[PDB]
From a paper:
The heterohexameric ATPases associated with diverse cellular activities (AAA)-ATPase Pex1/Pex6 is essential for the formation and maintenance of peroxisomes. Pex1/Pex6, similar to other AAA-ATPases, uses the energy from ATP hydrolysis to mechanically thread substrate proteins through its central pore, thereby unfolding them. Pex1 and Pex6 belong to a family of type 2 ATPases associated with diverse cellular activities (AAA)-ATPases that form hexameric complexes consisting of two stacked ATPase rings, D1 and D2, topped by N-terminal domains. Unlike these better-studied homohexameric AAA-ATPases, Pex1 and Pex6 form a heterohexameric ATPase with alternating Pex1 and Pex6 subunits.
Recombinant Pex1/Pex6 was incubated with ATP and an in vitro substrate mEOS-Pex15 1-309 and a 3D reconstruction was determined to ∼4 Å for the D1 domains and ∼5 to 9 Å for the D2 domains. We docked and rebuilt AlphaFold models of Pex1 and Pex6 into the cryo-EM map, starting with the Pex1 and Pex6 subunits at the highest overall resolution (Pex6–chain B and Pex1–chain C), and then fitting these models into the density of the other subunits. Although our biochemical assays suggest that Pex1/Pex6 unfolds the Pex15 1-309 domain of the mEOS-Pex15 1-309 fusion before stalling on the mEOS moiety, we did not observe density attributable to substrate in the central pore of this structure in 2D class averages or the final 3D reconstruction. Indeed, we find density for nucleotide in all the D1 ATPase domains, which we modeled as ATP. While the D1 ATPase domains do not have conserved hydrophobic pore loops, the helices that would position these loops in the central pore are on the same plane, making the D1 ATPase ring planar and symmetrical. In contrast to the well-resolved D1 ATPase ring, the resolution of the D2 ATPase domains is lower and varies by subunit position. This is consistent with a vertical “spiral staircase” configuration common to many AAA-ATPases. In this spiral staircase, subunit Pex1-A is in the highest position, Pex1-E is in the lowest position, and Pex6-F is the “seam” subunit at an intermediate position. The density and positions of Pex1-A, Pex6-B, Pex1-C, and Pex6-D are consistent with these subunits being nucleotide bound, and we have therefore modeled them with ATP in the binding pocket. Both Pex1-E and Pex6-F are at a lower resolution than the other domains and farther from the adjacent subunit and therefore were not modeled with nucleotide bound.
Residue numbers in the entry:
A (entry chain F): 1 to 1030
B (entry chain E): 924 to 1026
C (entry chain A): 463 to 923
D (entry chain B): 509 to 613
The structure:
């Protein structure tokens, strides 16, 4: 609720004075330990999250008057701060107490107060030195107690809550990195370092576009209701005192002749804008496109002195939006509304920005409403989405006044006439972020240093633009292509266009096509594009002609197709190229860019005719990091949070990790993950809100939410892709894993987890080959590696490759390898390589086909390790004695890991507990007895069969018991209920529940026989020994 | 040589990265969690302030092979050709030398 | 089809309007199909999105989306699957652009709701463009629901009433695999054929119910030639004791102790193969144990899938598997599987190989697809792929052995003493207490088919 | 429907056929109830076009099918005590979706 506010410098944890009217609402509560949350106006969209504070009553405070410590925030109220705030006293809920919190103390404080051996005395000293009371004080994260010497870092479970000296978790940490030294409150920097006091007329200062709109309720002093709202600029109070002018005054900004007026106010502390700077809306900046530093001088012109104009000629600024016939009506209506709002201030040659919600374009709404103020309150029912530009071409005055150059426009007295269109370059993104100021869908800001392709493409436009200005014409064209969709190549095109402040001419191929089959398609398309261009291009250069999904039109066609279609395609393409050439010629400086999903599909002729050809690849690790930063940015998160509460995530998120797991995705996937995290956050927040009734302030997103969102997105992507072999496996399902844990982890994940260390041009571990009794878990262990480490998996059985004579065997391994290269990261498995990798050189087969296969696999396995990081080869053998020795060499296989018969009872114990982890076992089961019972010759598959047979036996017992129940109850009740009916409704839970006894396992074990003969065990051990020896 | 060097450049300071910043002290009435969860994060949850990359550090030192390394590699690396293959192909090369192989 | 989605959406629209104040724009896709021209439509979607925005929040809905926006069925014949874009695909892209632009512009206001009959049928573009967050499939109704469906259906005709002895629970038991439309049609049938005989005061009867069901042909089974009526029972086949026990342990045991297997937490054994001597009864014991279980039976022979086109055969396999899965608990059977999915490397065009991987996708595909009881027979199992016989991956296989003295006597006694379907007495004029023992002696090495043929020609003599 | 169609290809075909049947039936039916609407070789219009055919014709056939179904439903709703009978020489051809929607066989 709206309550007056003032700042006292009594300390961060000093009590907050509350006016008695505020105190009354607490009422039944203690009335002495009153706690209230606050929200402070934020200079831009969104609201500062409410901070909870301990308050005390004070009648001296006037009606609805409160006092809060400014030092609590990083500033003291030297200059005036916000007059008001939004206060809320929580009545039903009480202040939560944070069990754990994080702090920071300077080195000297650590080494001095730590001297005491007792923590209670130290915390008592902390209370004395900081006025913090247990069960009385509330602590927030990122709170500063000493000016660069005391810090609060983190709080748990919540980021703020009541303090309990004894029971609370408190972290005693120091500042050994000298970070606290630089920590200082805003406005605390200057110990009144007296700036030069003078009556200087002009003071050259730097200019900055307003990051976001400023609400009028923050104008101290408040201005008049009817004052025009489009001519305001702001800065620190010190600048005004240097100009010895007051907030709400008129001051003239001039640079090399071009001058304008502006209404100037002060920025209420706390700050957040660069000091010694002048902030102006785009209105001012546009007139100063090339001026960052500009001169500012006082003004003595009074409001009454401003002349009133009668007729003003305005030439609409040339622009892509301006040429849309679909919008002319709505743009004109919003234009007329903009003047009808109130008296306008303008000068000759001035520019006018107008914003409108294009979605409301075709719906001409309530124009017959004569001079109705209600139009204001459709505005929030509207939301302006896109902007257009206007040029002050001429103003007509009827009397010579003091302020002849400037002038005022009144709808009841001033007439306006639209005129021809005038060209004007759009402001570069550097001078202002129009989307951000107007709160549109801000386009992701690249860091050119991390997006080399974007840098390369940009390195084209400005050079062309300069050479054109330098009198050098050159038809600079470029075509974007990619191997996968959903990469935002159009987004990067828009980003580049705004970066250079160049007009954009976007034409979706998949929007205006008509019938591209009849003998009109070529003509209709060419005419439509030509019309959409000629109407804007003459007054819009420099700009770019962008064709989205250009390939859709230019479809290369095979001969056997209908010849007429071939001819029509040849036309469409040739005249398309001719139109491009004519466009380039007629208007020098224009450049053409096209977006294509597949570079190859474009006809070769035009492609050659194209100048620059660039592919946009999938985002990389650091690129994913930047994308996550962008989306998770509060500005990106709160674009459309109409609900008052803001959204945000805890600082404890390891963005680097989320990037890591973000491999093999696209920007839309990342946006989907972020919005899914938004889902989970809002859902859980509303759940808690109904549960407890207290709002944990804003909404938060936890790393688990994003992890699960990426999991689900990857599941959908996988269903889209071929790889079906990553469903679900973990270590709990398989034992016998600890024996080679170190080797497997070092071989697999270390190169992935430390590539820069492996970027030494070193042979990355080629692969792993496993051998031993079948069913021991070799394939299961490989699947565990794949699923835990999340690499695309395909299983290939060597024997399946062999054909009658040689249909296709080498080509097949080549296809699997290349498709693996597409689906990086990935893991490839060969089942029974011995059946495809036998010892060669001694025997002579019939045809010798296999020799080339083994040579090819050797050569490929050696050729991938050099650079092909992310793809790894693993083979499976059960009779390695047949395996060719050439593979045993490092480079083909270096870690000949083994998975043998379970010798010790621990192996069988782990295997059985992993197998029956999800069995509904009676307590009688004592698996040690079974492990001793099982001869060591039993393998993992033997244990799987054992568990399955024990389930079968137990289900048989339960079935016999159920049949006995059925018969008994049948005789008792006199009817004949079918088993199905008995199970649908008569069956209670115990009927549907399965109970397992040790007797079932004993029966299964007695029924099971060695899957491997002891002679086979000795053969396997001998083969092991012989291979391990060398 | 690189296997030898794995104890020459990796031995530097602590395991690759930054360490030896330890934990200072605690005040809990039972909550004695000193693990990295509240150690790596919190104080320095970011590895460094706005962490990024820098000049060559991971592979600063090349594992320059030594005369002993080459000596032992020679003996470890067995001949890739059996004498039977050598003599057979040489004899066949002479047989075609009677006609073409040579002059 | 037939799950009454349309009414689901109408009831929805009603509830959402009454409870949460969302402007809703219902529009069936049939009308748009009426004039599915790109520009004309583009205009309509503009109008829609504009109006829907005009009332924030809004909700679009389109029953039968596939009708208009449904991408032509994947292949559709043209090798140029890429490069060129189907008109409806362009329309979907247009709609996507508008709605997603508004969404980023305003998540709250507009929330579309599509309605289709299959994920693949619906154009995948929306999926690839991440337009759809999550989807729900309307499964066939359950018996417990069918109770209330019928209790409201014949309520609609308030005149008719059930019988005291009969109960809605019955209706649920016999009814199955019937969508609400199917239950509607069945109740209309029962009302009409009840009005046939005007003796009772429109009271249900067991006999009219049975006659109606017998005459009934539900949509799911409609349009399919289910070769099920064979009437081969235990009495028709008595030998192969081990095969009988294994088949009971596989088929009858689940249907007879479902409660126990419900929590049996390994995935149940999918199905078993049959092999043995030609004509040795592999086609017979399967049907006999199917009747034992009373489960749904389908006999699929090698040819049914095989076709002329390449790629179309795979989709024929696809909807074959769709039908098979739709009828849990059902038995699917493939005869002459040696002519269906042999070992790879036995085809120049490789259509056999791709077909085989297609088949493997389903069984190896862990999608809760286990109610269908897969089955197959072949006299030449050697010709099948080993992967199709991997233990654990696939279940046991059943051998058929030579009928020796014991088995020969068993089969001879069974067939000679067979009670007729038309008459009930012996199928043959059976010697009351002749010496059937000596007959088996001279039939060493025969086959049950040979034994029955011997008896048949003896009956002719 | 085997005789008077007078049009089977043109995209207007579906509209022409449906409009003609609707025109005649609503022209005569209102004053003639009770009555029966009979379609001879009804299948010759309704069928399940194979995927082995150009798409737009499949769309046209799906349309004509849907409007036939809507026509029968509208006629029965608007004219109580009215029924129809259809004749077909093979069940397999008629749209299964349509068949399910009907009552008697
Ligand atoms: N870093 C980014 N790169 C690309 N797109 C991004 C990025 N961040 C956000 N996006 C969003 O992803 C979408 C990119 O779509 P866009 O049409 O530009 O893709 P494209 O690569 O041309 O793909 P296609 O033509 O196959 O759909 C936009 O909605 C854009 O706002
Ligand atoms: N709540 C309900 N849900 C589903 N069906 C219902 C419901 N109540 C009644 N039914 C019956 O289900 C059938 C609904 O048919 P409907 O035409 O709506 O099918 P649909 O599955 O929506 O598909 P389509 O419109 O494409 O044919 C009718 O026979 C109706 O009597
Ligand atoms: N026990 C039996 N064993 C074999 N055939 C029997 C037996 N009892 C009856 N028959 C009759 O013998 C014939 C069995 O041939 P059937 O084709 O059904 O067998 P199959 O083993 O499935 O062979 P195939 O796969 O070659 O068709 C049928 O005519 C059946 O009526």
């Amino acid at each position: 609720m709206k309550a007056s506010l003032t700042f006292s410098l009594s300390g961060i944890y000093a009590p907050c004075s509350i006016s008695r009217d505020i105190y009354l609402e607490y009422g039944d509560k203690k009335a002495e330990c009153l706690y209230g949350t606050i929200r402070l106006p934020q200079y831009g969209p969104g609201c500062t999250p409410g901070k909870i504070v301990h308050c005390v009553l004070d009648d001296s405070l006037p009606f609805c008057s409160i006092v809060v410590p400014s030092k609590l925030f990083g500033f003291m109220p030297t200059q005036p701060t916000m007059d008001f705030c939004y206060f809320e006293p929580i009545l039903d809920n009480v202040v939560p107490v944070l069990d754990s919190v994080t702090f920071l103390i300077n080195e000297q404080l650590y080494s001095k107060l730590m001297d005491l051996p007792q923590e209670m005395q130290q915390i008592q000293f902390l209370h004395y030195k900081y006025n913090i009371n247990s069960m009385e004080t509330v602590v927030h994260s990122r709170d500063i107690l000493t000016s660069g010497l005391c810090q609060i870092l983190n709080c748990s479970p919540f980021p703020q809550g009541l303090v309990d000296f004894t029971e609370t978790q408190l972290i005693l940490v120091n500042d050994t990195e000298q970070k606290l030294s630089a920590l200082k409150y805003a406005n605390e920097d200057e110990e009144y370092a007296l700036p030069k006091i003078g009556t200087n007329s002009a003071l050259s200062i730097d200019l900055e576009s307003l990051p976001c709109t400023i609400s009028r309720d923050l104008l101290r002093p408040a201005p008049h209701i009817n004052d025009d709202n489009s001519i305001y600029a702001f800065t620190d109070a010190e600048t005004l005192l240097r100009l010895d002018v007051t907030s709400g005054s008129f001051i003239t900004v001039s640079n090399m002749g071009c001058v304008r007026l502006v209404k100037l106010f002060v920025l209420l502390l706390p700050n957040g804008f660069k000091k010694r700077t002048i902030y102006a809306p785009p209105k001012i900046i546009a007139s100063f496109p090339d001026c960052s530093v500009v001169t500012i001088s006082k003004s003595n012109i009074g409001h009454t002195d401003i002349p009133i104009a009668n007729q003003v000629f305005i030439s609409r600024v040339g622009g892509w939006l301006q040429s849309q016939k679909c919008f002319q009506n709505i743009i004109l209506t919003t234009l007329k509304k903009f003047f009808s709002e109130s008296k306008r201030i303008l000068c000759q040659n001035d520019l006018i920005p107008i914003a409108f919600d294009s979605s409301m374009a075709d719906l001409n709404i309530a124009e017959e409403n004569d001079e109705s103020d209600d139009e204001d309150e459709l505005g929030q029912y509207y939301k302006n989405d896109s902007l257009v530009w206007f040029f002050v071409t001429s103003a007509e005055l009827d009397c010579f006044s003091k302020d002849n150059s400037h002038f005022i426009i009144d709808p009841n007295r001033t007439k306006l006439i639209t005129t021809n269109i005038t060209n004007r370059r759009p402001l570069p993104l550097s001078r202002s972020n129009l989307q951000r100021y107007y709160g549109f869908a801000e386009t992701f800001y690249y860091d050119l240093h991390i997006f080399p392709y974007v840098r390369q493409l940009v390195n084209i436009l400005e050079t062309s633009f300069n050479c054109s200005q330098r009198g050098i014409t050159l038809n600079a064209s470029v075509l974007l292509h990619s191997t996968t969709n959903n990469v935002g190549k159009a987004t990067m095109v828009r980003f580049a266009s705004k970066y250079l402040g160049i007009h954009l001419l976007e034409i979706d191929c998949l929007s205006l096509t008509s019938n591209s089959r009849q003998l009109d398609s070529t003509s209709k398309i060419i005419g439509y594009i030509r019309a959409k261009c000629e109407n804007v291009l003459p007054y819009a250069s420099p700009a770019v002609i962008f064709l989205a999904h250009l390939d859709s039109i230019l479809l290369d066609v095979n001969a056997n197709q209908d010849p007429e279609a071939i001819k029509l395609q040849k036309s469409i393409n040739f005249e398309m190229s001719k139109l491009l050439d004519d466009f380039t010629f007629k208007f020098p400086g224009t450049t053409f860019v096209g977006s294509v999903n597949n570079i190859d599909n474009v006809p070769s002729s035009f492609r050659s005719h194209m100048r620059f050809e660039i592919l946009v690849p999938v985002p990389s690790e650091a690129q994913r990091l930047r994308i996550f930063q962008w989306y998770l940015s509060s500005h990106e998160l709160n674009r459309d949070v109409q609900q008052k509460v803001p959204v945000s995530y805890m600082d404890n998120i390891s963005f680097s990790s989320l990037s890591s797991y973000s491999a093999g995705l696209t920007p839309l996937d990342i946006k989907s993950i972020v919005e899914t995290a938004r889902m989970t956050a809002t859902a859980r927040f509303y759940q808690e809100s109904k549960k407890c009734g207290w709002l944990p302030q804003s909404i938060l997103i936890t790393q688990e939410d994003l992890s699960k969102a990426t999991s689900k997105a990857r599941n959908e992507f996988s269903v889209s892709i071929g790889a079906p072999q990553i469903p679900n496996v973990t270590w709990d399902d398989i034992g016998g894993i600890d024996f080679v844990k170190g080797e497997i982890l070092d071989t697999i994940d270390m190169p992935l987890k430390h590539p820069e260390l492996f970027t030494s041009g070193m042979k990355k571990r080629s692969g792993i080959l496993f051998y031993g009794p079948p069913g021991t878990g070799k394939t299961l262990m490989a699947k565990a590696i794949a699923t835990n480490f999340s690499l695309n998996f395909f299983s290939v059985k060597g024997p399946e490759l062999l054909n009658m004579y040689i249909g296709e065997s080498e080509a097949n391994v080549r296809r699997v390898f290349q498709k693996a290269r597409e689906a990086k990261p990935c893991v490839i498995f060969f089942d029974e390589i011995d059946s495809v990798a036998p010892k060669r050189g001694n025997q002579g087969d019939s045809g010798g086909v296999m020799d080339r296969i083994v040579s090819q696999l050797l050569a490929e396995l050696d050729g991938m390790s050099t650079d092909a990081d992310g793809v790894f080869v693993i083979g499976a053998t059960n009779r390695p004695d047949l395996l060719d020795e050439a593979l045993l060499r490092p480079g083909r296989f270096d870690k000949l890991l083994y998975l043998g018969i379970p010798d010790t009872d621990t192996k069988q114990l782990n295997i059985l507990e992993a197998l029956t982890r999800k069995f509904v076992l009676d307590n009688d089961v004592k698996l040690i007895e079974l492990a001793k019972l099982c001869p060591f010759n039993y393998t993992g598959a033997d244990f799987y069969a054992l568990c399955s047979d024990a389930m079968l036996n137990a289900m048989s017992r339960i079935a016999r018991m159920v049949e006995k129940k059925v018969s008994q109850h049948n005789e008792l009740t006199g009817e004949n209920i079918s088993t199905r009916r008995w199970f649908d409704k008569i069956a209670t839970k115990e009927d549907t529940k399965v109970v397992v006894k040790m007797e079932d396992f004993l029966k299964a074990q007695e029924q099971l026989t060695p899957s491997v003969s002891r002679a086979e065990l000795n053969h396997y051990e001998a083969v092991r020994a012989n291979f391990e020896g060398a | 040589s690189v296997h030898r060097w794995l104890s020459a450049a990796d031995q530097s300071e602590v395991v690759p990265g930054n360490d030896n910043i330890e934990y200072f002290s605690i005040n809990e009435h039972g909550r004695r969690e000193e693990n990295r969860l509240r150690l790596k994060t919190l104080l320095q949850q970011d590895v460094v302030h706005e962490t990024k990359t820098s000049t060559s550090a991971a592979s600063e030192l090349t594992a320059v092979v030594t005369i002993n390394d080459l000596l032992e590699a020679c003996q470890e690396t067995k001949p890739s050709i059996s004498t039977s293959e050598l003599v057979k192909l040489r004899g066949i090369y002479d047989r075609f030398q009677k006609d073409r192989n040579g002059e | 089809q037939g799950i009454g989605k349309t009414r689901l959406l109408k009831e929805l629209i009603n509830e959402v309007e009454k409870d949460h104040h969302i402007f809703v724009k219902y529009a069936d896709c049939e009308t748009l199909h009426e004039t599915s021209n790109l520009d004309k439509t583009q205009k309509l979607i503009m109008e829609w999105c504009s109006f829907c925005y005009w009332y924030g929040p809004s909700l679009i809905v389109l029953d039968n989306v596939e009708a208009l926006f449904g991408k032509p069925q994947a292949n559709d014949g043209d090798p140029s699957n890429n490069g060129q874009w189907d008109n409806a695909s362009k329309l979907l892209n247009f709609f996507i652009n508008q709605v997603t632009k508004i969404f980023n512009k305003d998540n709250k206001r507009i929330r579309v709701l599509f309605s289709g009959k299959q994920k693949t049928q619906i154009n995948p573009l929306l999926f690839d463009k991440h337009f759809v967050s999550e989807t729900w499939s309307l499964r066939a109704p359950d018996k417990h629901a069918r109770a209330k469906l019928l209790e409201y259906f014949f309520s609609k005709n308030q005149i008719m009433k059930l019988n005291r002895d009969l109960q809605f629970s019955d209706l649920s038991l016999e009814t199955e695999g019937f969508s609400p439309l199917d239950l509607e049609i069945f109740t209309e049938k029962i009302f009409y054929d009840l009005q046939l005989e005007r003796d009772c005061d429109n009271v249900v009867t067991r006999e009219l119910f049975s006659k109606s069901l017998s005459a009934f042909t539900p949509s799911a089974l409609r349009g399919v030639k289910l070769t099920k009526e064979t009437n081969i029972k235990w009495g028709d086949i008595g030998a192969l004791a081990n095969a009988k026990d294994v088949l009971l342990e596989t088929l009858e045991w689940p249907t007879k102790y479902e409660p126990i297997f419900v929590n049996c937490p390994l995935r149940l054994r999918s199905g078993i193969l049959l092999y043995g001597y030609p004509g040795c009864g592999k086609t017979l014991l399967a049907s006999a144990v199917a009747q034992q279980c009373g489960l749904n039976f389908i006999s699929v022979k090698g040819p049914e899938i095989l076709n002329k086109f390449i790629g179309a055969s795979e989709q024929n396999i696809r909807e074959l598997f769709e039908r098979a899965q739709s009828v849990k608990p059902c038995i699917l059977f493939f005869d002459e599987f040696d002519s269906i999915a042999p070992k790879r490397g036995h085809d120049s065009t490789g259509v056999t190989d791709r077909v085989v991987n297609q088949l493997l996708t389903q069984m190896d595909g862990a999608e809760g697809l286990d109610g269908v009881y897969i089955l197959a027979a072949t006299s030449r199992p050697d010709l099948i792929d080993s992967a199709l016989l991997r233990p654990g991956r696939l279940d046991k296989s059943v051998i058929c052995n030579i009928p020796t003295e014991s088995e020969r006597l068993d089969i001879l006694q069974a067939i000679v003493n067979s009670k007729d379907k038309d008459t009930g007495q012996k199928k043959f004029a059976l010697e009351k207490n002749a010496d059937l023992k000596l007959i088996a002696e001279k039939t060493a090495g025969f086959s049950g088919a040979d034994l029955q043929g011997l008896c048949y020609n003896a009956y002719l003599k």
